[PDB]
From a paper:
For [name]/A, the HC/A binds to both a ganglioside (e.g., [name]) and synaptic vesicle protein 2 (SV2C) at the nerve terminals of the neuromuscular junction. In this paper, we present the crystal structures of the [name] A2 cell binding domain, both alone and in complex with its receptor ganglioside [name] at 1.63 and 2.10 Å, respectively.
The structure of HC/A2:[name] complex was solved by molecular replacement to 2.1 Å with two molecules (A and B) in the asymmetric unit. Clear positive difference map electron density was observed at the GBS of molecule B that could be readily modelled as [name], whereas for molecule A, the GBS is inaccessible to [name] due to crystal packing. Therefore, the HC/A2:[name] asymmetric unit contains both the [name]-bound and unbound states of HC/A2. A total of 5/6 monosaccharides are clearly defined by the electron density. [name] forms a total of 10 hydrogen bonding interactions to HC/A2, two of which are water-mediated. Using DynDom (which estimates domain motions in proteins), the HCN/A2 subdomain appears to rotate 3.6° in one direction when bound to [name], but 6.7° in the other direction when bound to SV2C. In both the HC/A2 and HC/A2:[name] structures, clear electron density was observed between Lys 1236 and Cys 1280 indicating the presence of an unusual covalent bridge between the two residues.
Author numbering: 871 to 1226, 1233 to 1295
The structure:
Amino acid sequence: KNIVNTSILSIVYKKDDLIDLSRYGAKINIGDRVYYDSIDKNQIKLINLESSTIEVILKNAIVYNSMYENFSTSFWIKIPKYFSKINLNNEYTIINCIENNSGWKVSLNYGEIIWTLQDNKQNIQRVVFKYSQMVNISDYINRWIFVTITNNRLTKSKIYINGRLIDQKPISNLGNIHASNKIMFKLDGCRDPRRYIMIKYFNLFDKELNEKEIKDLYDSQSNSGILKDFWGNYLQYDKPYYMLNLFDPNKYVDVNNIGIRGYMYLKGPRGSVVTTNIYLNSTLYEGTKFIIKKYASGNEDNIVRNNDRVYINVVVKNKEYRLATNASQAGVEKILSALEIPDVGNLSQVVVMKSKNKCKMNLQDNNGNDIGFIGFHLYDNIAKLVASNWYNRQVGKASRTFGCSWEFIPVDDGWGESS
């Protein structure tokens, strides 16, 4: 019943190959320089080499002249930060269904995801998503984005980003769009040899998806049982993460002293990384690193899941300490401390990991009672990290709750700031 089942092409990883999950069984030819993420094999990396290619041949049986009258494409994409002036004014095709100068393609440029419909009279229409590299904290740079492009020959071509309309151009003026049976995924025309993309869950639909169908597609493909890091990859155990509190993203976490008389606090503003005319962003690699440690998970995999019960380690001067509190302290607000792992004793330290990318951490006492979601509280102009059941009540008493949602930011090559 999810609209994704109606896909006429659904590229997924199985065994050691990409296959069409649709019942229409397209053929998929993979070049020698196509890579899969060791953790999430559906994450495909295409690099800037002629052998980094995925060729889809649709069955001629499903390819008909008027199929591109109503159609949508959906996929997820991770586009590394553009670092060089070579990247400016260099539109490069990534997904090509063009034959006899008619069809559709997806291209990228500096801060752009571009859709092109060409008819058989060579009239073109472009819809364009623009994202700035001149922002403190980008929702788009080097992060998994869900793209949905819908097309109705009587109305418009529309581009959606994470389920939200961004551009729309009327296409009623265009002629007939040639239906190729070939789709080529490959970097085409990119003058920067170090460029790559990552792509997952490519779908083609023989329909103009509506807003409500795009939202179900986005929500269904999110995998909300697995937590995500800032980039949108799987959250992992034993991996160091810089912390961001979504209520105040211009701050980072620091530790004031080790032990139960010490505390953790939000501090800012963030620094800045710059290449004039290319990017200006807040530094992400700032503050105390958190490491998620297995408590209730076995050594099956290192993936952190919804409702996993974990420990949190905190790195101070390349040494690990345990996030803990005394649940007995006066007041709802329990100030967190970084404790010597030997000393934690019976101090509350078990955290329930939850999805709302948007991670929550529910601290529990040693009887499995809630101490509360990890957030912060102002004590005389210091925003100290706390566990507070204030947050747990507010979730049930308000449409929204602010301050107990976090992002976990590991070092990533597509971001390229010094670690």
